[PDB]
Design a protein that fits this description.
The structure is a homodimer.
Chain A lengths: L5 H13 L5 H12 L10 E2 L6 E2 L4 H11 L3 E5 L6 E6 L26 E3 L4 H10 L4 E5 L5 E6 H9 L7
Parallel strand pairs in A: 2-3, 5-6
Antiparallel strand pairs in A: 1-7, 3-4, 6-7
Helix pairs in contact in A: 1-2
Protein name (chain A): Hemolysin
Subcellular location (chain A): Membrane
């Protein structure tokens, strides 16, 4: 019945927290849902200078060594430099070859998944929708000149809703 | 000071005013429904669990991963009704093929389990998973048997919808 703007809705959500009608984390999650459409992926991505990446003609043994050193479960794959991403490799795919053959016998290109590119100013609400329907849960973020701006994952969006939960061990 | 009755009317008013689109309001409703969802309704039941005995070798675990593709595997002692931990398949990458895989068993890499009752709500579960920094819980029945398993992703999918595998 009441005519309610999105601005008013946010203010009422704070009032429901103070009223104890909703728990503080319930309010924060609902508020974060509302902020998704206003959050560009540039603010939640792993930036280019912080991402773990590997060249396409490296071997699965190099990828294994990379995993043991940095813990990155998903690794962008590039040809000449990190500004030319040609796909994405998953550390867990090594388990299909580990101790079954010499990991030096295959290149990373042989297990690479096709990349999904999103611009820096895409909003996190749109990103959530796009990521959910695809079999790869990460996107390569591209700057306004076509270079690599960074990486963003479905997990990164989820964490904006529920907070950080757990990472490594 | 806003009552819980008003909050539900206001979210309804907000969709009808154009403030939020229906998917957004579906997500918000799911958030508010988490405390009324028992883990029993979102868990993988015992009859669909993939589990491994704790004295199986790391080689057995690797073979099981290739057959069934589960990244996290409950670990049990005598039958699946005595879960003693959880094994993470990528931890295998940290062990050498030459002797660790037949020299070690799943018990060498198991993480201690977190047990919850069947009627625990998904809101309480989410908070506990956050506090304990684990992504999985073993759901137990009233008699201490294994009812199933429930994961952080199970809860997330209640909020955002199905995630294509």
């Amino acid at each position: 019945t009441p005519l309610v703007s999105e601005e008013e809705l946010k203010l009422i959500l704070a009032g429901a927290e103070e009223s104890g009608a909703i728990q503080p984390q319930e309010e924060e999650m609902i508020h974060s849902i509302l902020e998704l459409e206003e959050t560009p992926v540039r603010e939640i991505m792993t930036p280019r200078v912080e991402m773990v990446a590997i060249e396409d003609e490296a071997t699965l043994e190099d990828l294994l060594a990379l995993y043991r050193e940095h813990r990155a479960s998903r690794v962008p794959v590039y040809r000449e430099s990190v500004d030319h991403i040609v796909g994405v490799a998953y550390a867990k795919d090594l388990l299909d070859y580990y101790c079954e053959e010499d990991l030096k016998g295959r290149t990373v290109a042989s297990i690479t998944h096709p990349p999904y590119f999103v611009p820096e100013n895409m909003d996190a609400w749109s990103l959530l929708k796009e990521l959910r329907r695809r079999k790869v849960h990460m996107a390569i973020v591209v700057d306004e000149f076509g270079g690599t701006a960074g990486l963003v994952t479905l997990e990164d969006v989820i964490e904006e809703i529920v907070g950080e939960i757990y990472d490594e061990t």
